[PDB]
Every structure is written in structure tokens, then in C-alpha cells.
Design a protein around this ligand. Sequence first.
Ligand SMILES: [Cl-]
Ligand SMILES: [Cl-]
Ligand SMILES: [Hg+2]
Ligand SMILES: [Hg+2]
Ligand SMILES: [Hg+2]
Length: 60
Amino acid sequence: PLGSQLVVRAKFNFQQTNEDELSFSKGDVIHVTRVEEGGWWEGTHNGRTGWFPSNYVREI
Ligand SMILES: [Cl-]
Ligand SMILES: [Cl-]
Ligand SMILES: [Hg+2]
Ligand SMILES: [Hg+2]
Ligand SMILES: [Hg+2]
């Protein structure tokens, strides 16, 4: 559970590949909540929480 206040911006549109993943549109800002090796981070956006590809975002 990330303690710092990391925010990222989506570089692409992402359709969740699983129910536990975050769908989002290019330009959306995501608040990172978990960061695990493997390329998938967990995050929040508009009250929704889930995993997403870390290579789809740019740290703000
Ligand atoms: Cl969205
Ligand atoms: Cl948005
Ligand atoms: Hg992956
Ligand atoms: Hg969203
Ligand atoms: Hg939003």
C-alpha cells in the first residue's frame, strides 16, 4: 500500500483484460496505490480501483 502520493497520466486507452483491472482513457489521471514488479500497478480513478499496465502511464 503505497505511502507516497504518486499520480500518473494515461498514454493510451486501456480496456481491462480482467474484472480486477482498471479501464481508462488516454489523458486520464490515476492515483497509484500499489506498485509491484511485473509491470502492473494498482490505482484509482473516479472511485474505481484496479490493476493496470505501468507502461501505459507517465508519472506526473
Ligand atoms: Cl476513464
Ligand atoms: Cl479521466
Ligand atoms: Hg503484464
Ligand atoms: Hg475511471
Ligand atoms: Hg476523472
